[PDB]
Design a protein around this ligand. Structure first.
Ligand SMILES: C[C@]12CC[C@@H]3c4ccc(O)cc4CC[C@H]3[C@@H]1C[C@@H](O)C2=O
Ligand SMILES: C[C@]12CC[C@@H]3c4ccc(O)cc4CC[C@H]3[C@@H]1C[C@@H](O)C2=O
Lengths: 10, 240, 240, 9
């Protein structure tokens, strides 16, 4: 699970 | 979709202008000695915090949010240090000889020498800044460049034939915007394309810098000088 | 004293078409990784001496000091080798035509550790060229910009400053040439600016790959899988 | 340097 992946919908 | 595509030139540069991220400050505490590990730690700290605003700016760039997360992630992974670097150069523009990382972190040539490998990149970064000043870069020219670096830099390493050309279709819009700005500044049709080329030719120098710095950054992680935000670790790991 | 400045738009494209290097051959005849990188490096080493004559023959280039030509070329060499190769493999989807009898599949690049990522970027790149139907008279302009743009902000007096502006002067001429060509093919202004950009925006990709191919090239020499020529060594050591 | 020679030649 990528930090960037989550940040982009955060 | 078309939100992005159905934009005026001026609606365009307006949207880019207010998507601008804030200039952050440095955790720099001057009542302590300057280490290679100290100032590498300062910069990466600063950088890590800057990536989070960049990610908000990105989503605020027309066209961008229309990509799936794999493409958004890939564009942002491939373009991130370039965007950090073009921002930094804009910042220290009217500080010749210096690089303004944060209004409380303003470094110069020698100060780069405090950590090994760093100075070569300082030197180029400085030169890129001088060239922007020589060329009298406008802020409306800068935000467009920034948006181009986002969309273009990773575009050729994902291809998805139809995401491909809608990225291409936005990137076109931006050169249209960029030109429309040059027209409006009262540049002659031949200055318009002449300068368009000058700007876009620097982006290549910026890709050259990003790559060198990405290589330096990787060295620090491997010589263990500083610990790196788990997020920065994911960014560097997108490179190899 | 600068009569590369007094060229006409067509005396230019014809000058550059005229300087074009010949298309070298492999001396190739089981595929080892040291076997094939032997191949690609003795090919590239031959390539380099032809490139130097073609450099001399790019209008405005021999006006430059000898030390300035050196640096432009050790900065620009692998980029030029790649854009050439990418032009070569244009009408060969999926395959990289290094020599007429050495056309590697995007799979045979697995034969050298981490070579395949680079293959793919080159493949991506010619796929781009192909799809935007890049013309041969543009390619030679592209190829000339690359030599002139790549090392020009790594200059660092009053006289050394006029070099920068000299070469920026010719670089603006090659823009006018590129754009003349597009006027001639019947492209509207908008289609002109926009394609100008498209071409210049891929030059950053080229520079990316050059950067990346230079650290592969370097990791290859260090574990000594094949002996490099002396020129090839020099070309590489200059980046480090 | 090899390249240096090659330029003057
Ligand atoms: C990534 C970096 C540490 C952080 C620096 C940095 C940090 C913040 C910023 O806004 C711009 C830059 C530009 C260069 C960046 C450096 C280049 C590289 O040498 C390095 O370690
Ligand atoms: C130098 C090289 C091996 C030889 C290749 C090569 C060889 C011949 C040629 O005409 C073009 C190219 C383009 C890329 C070049 C490769 C890139 C780099 O990964 C490498 O090891």
């Amino acid at each position: 699970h990528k930090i960037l992946h989550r940040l982009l919908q955060d | 979709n078309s939100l992005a595509l159905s934009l005026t030139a001026d609606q365009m540069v307006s949207a880019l202008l207010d998507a601008e991220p804030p200039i952050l400050y440095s955790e720099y505490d001057p009542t302590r000695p300057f280490s290679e590990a100290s100032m590498m730690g300062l910069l990466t700290n600063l950088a890590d915090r800057e990536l989070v605003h960049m990610i908000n700016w990105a989503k605020r760039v027309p066209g961008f949010v229309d990509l799936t997360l794999h493409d958004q992630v890939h564009l942002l992974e491939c373009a991130w240090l370039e965007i950090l670097m073009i921002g930094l150069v804009w910042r220290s523009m009217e500080h010749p000889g210096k690089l303004l990382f944060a209004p409380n972190l303003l470094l110069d040539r020698n100060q780069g020498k405090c950590v090994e490998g760093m100075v070569e990149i300082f030197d180029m970064l400085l030169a890129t800044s001088s060239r922007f000043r020589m060329m009298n870069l406008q802020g409306e020219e800068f935000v467009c460049l920034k948006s181009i670096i986002l969309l273009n830099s990773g575009v050729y390493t994902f291809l998805s034939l139809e995401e491909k050309d809608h990225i291409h279709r936005v990137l076109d819009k931006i050169t249209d915007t960029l030109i429309h700005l040059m027209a409006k500044a009262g540049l002659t049709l031949q200055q318009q394309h002449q300068r368009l080329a000058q700007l876009l030719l620097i982006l290549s120098h910026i890709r050259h810098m990003s790559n060198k710095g990405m290589e330096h950054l990787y060295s620090m992680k491997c010589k263990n000088v500083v610990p790196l935000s788990d997020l920065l670790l994911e960014m560097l790991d997108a490179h190899r």
